[PDB]
Amino acid sequence: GDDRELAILATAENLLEDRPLADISVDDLAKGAGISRPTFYFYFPSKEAVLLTLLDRVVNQADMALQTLAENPADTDRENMWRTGINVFFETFGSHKAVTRAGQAARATSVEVAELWSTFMQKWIAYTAAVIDAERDRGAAPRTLPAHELATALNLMNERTLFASFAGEQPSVPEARVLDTLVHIWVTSIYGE
Amino acid sequence: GDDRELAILATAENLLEDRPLADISVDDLAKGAGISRPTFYFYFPSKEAVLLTLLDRVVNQADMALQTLAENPADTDRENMWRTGINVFFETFGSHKAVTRAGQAARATSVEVAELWSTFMQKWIAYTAAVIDAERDRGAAPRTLPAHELATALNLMNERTLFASFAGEQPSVPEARVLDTLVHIWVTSIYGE
Ligand SMILES: O=C(Cc1ccc(F)cc1)Nc1nc(-c2ccccn2)cs1
Ligand SMILES: O=C(Cc1ccc(F)cc1)Nc1nc(-c2ccccn2)cs1
């Protein structure tokens, strides 16, 4: 039953690694999942709903990993704290590059995908800002920019930079360098001046 | 003659301020430009070619303004130097928000638009890196990250952040705050540690 749903999702993630969603048909998803096309439409109204489901799984995986980190701080310096947090997104989305790239593109076309991404970005930015505010309250970071505006720009940088690296866009930071690059910019802008 | 081309371009820029390119027809562009549909196809093969032309004008305007700045340095501190450069893009693209937003979306669909954007981003990143390298050579900036990788991430941040602000996305930095926000992150990451 729901097994067939997971088969549809797995087939979609596999096919997205080699072609965009526009080049994938409902019949391709049904055929790969071992079901008929009418049976597919029982589980999903469209191939776009399949992508939205895949993206929802990935963003919730990242959100849950960040929540785990937040509840069990690693005893390290400040640079390591930020690196471990940025790494949650590097590893989670980097493990699902086809879904990430496809979900990014679908933001222009799908209001559901745009709303899903916006909801989680607001959550992650609020958490970033709250940690920056905590660092300021304890005297470790200077009161420079409004924390929420700083957090917004830094999170948007990570979105654009990580996704460019994963897609091998030109220009991009090589994926083997992108964590160090982002961590440097976060740490200097949060603690600097 | 070429006057009718400029009328097509002006009509397209005006219509894009109120609806996306998918909701604009070749007939809408012809009607607004005072020409017939066959006459339009003399000047442009498609409405997508009109957008590519509009975007080419905007990116070359920004590139030429940056070249002007590079040849006449303003006598100021380092923070003002970076602010004046970032402002070139804030003002140029912020004066053509509909074209910017439409060109951003067309990157997913149009290889010509993606290549145009990539060509100019590589140019602007190379210039950023060369200035960072100059600052390091004169002892003003520390040798931290590879300059070209730092320049890449900072330019990608500006792309994503400026365009989110112009479109009023949620989340975004308010447009009245985005220049200060970006300048802070550039200056601390270039001169910090
Ligand atoms: O970077 C993002 C958001 C993102 C990344 C990649 C995307 F593709 C889309 C969104 N969120 C982050 N939060 C932290 C953080 C905050 C507080 C304490 C520790 N770590 C580090 S990175
Ligand atoms: O920020 C960008 C690229 C960009 C911005 C907005 C976009 F929408 C798309 C690309 N380029 C910049 N170069 C400088 C600079 C470099 C050296 C000296 C002085 N200024 C400042 S900002």
Swiss-Prot record, chains A, B:
One Pfam family matching this protein: TetR_N
Q: What happens when the gene is disrupted?
A: Cells lacking this gene leads to ETH hypersentivity.
Identify the keywords attached in UniProt to this record, alphabetized. DNA-binding, Repressor, Transcription, Transcription regulation
The site (Inhibitor-binding) lies at 155, 158
**SUPFAM superfamilies associated with the record:** Homeodomain-like (SSF46689), Tetracyclin repressor-like, C-terminal domain (SSF48498)
Entry keyword annotation includes Cell membrane: no
Gene Ontology cellular-component annotations: cytosol
- As annotated, the DNA-binding region falls at 25-44
Please name the InterPro entries in this protein's record.
EthR_C (IPR049397), Homeodomain-like_sf (IPR009057), HTH-type_TetR-like_transc_reg (IPR050109), HTH_TetR (IPR001647), Tet_transcr_reg_TetR-rel_C_sf (IPR036271)
- Gene Ontology molecular function terms on file: DNA-binding transcription factor activity; transcription cis-regulatory region binding
Indicate the segments forming the HTH tetR-type domain, all copies: 2-62
DNA-binding: present as a keyword of the record? yes
Q: Name one GO biological process term.
A: regulation of DNA-templated transcription
The further comment given in this record reads: Binding of inhibitors to EthR induces a conformational change in this repressor, which is then unable to bind its DNA operator, consequently allowing for increased transcription of EthA and bioactivation of ethionamide (ETH).
Q: What does this protein do?
A: Involved in the repression of the monooxygenase EthA which is responsible of the formation of the active metabolite of ethionamide (ETH).
Q: How does it assemble?
A: Homodimer.
Q: What name appears for this protein in its UniProt entry?
A: HTH-type transcriptional regulator EthR
- Protein's organism: Mycobacterium tuberculosis (strain ATCC 25618 / H37Rv)
- Lineage summary: Bacteria, Bacillati, Actinomycetota, Actinomycetes, Mycobacteriales
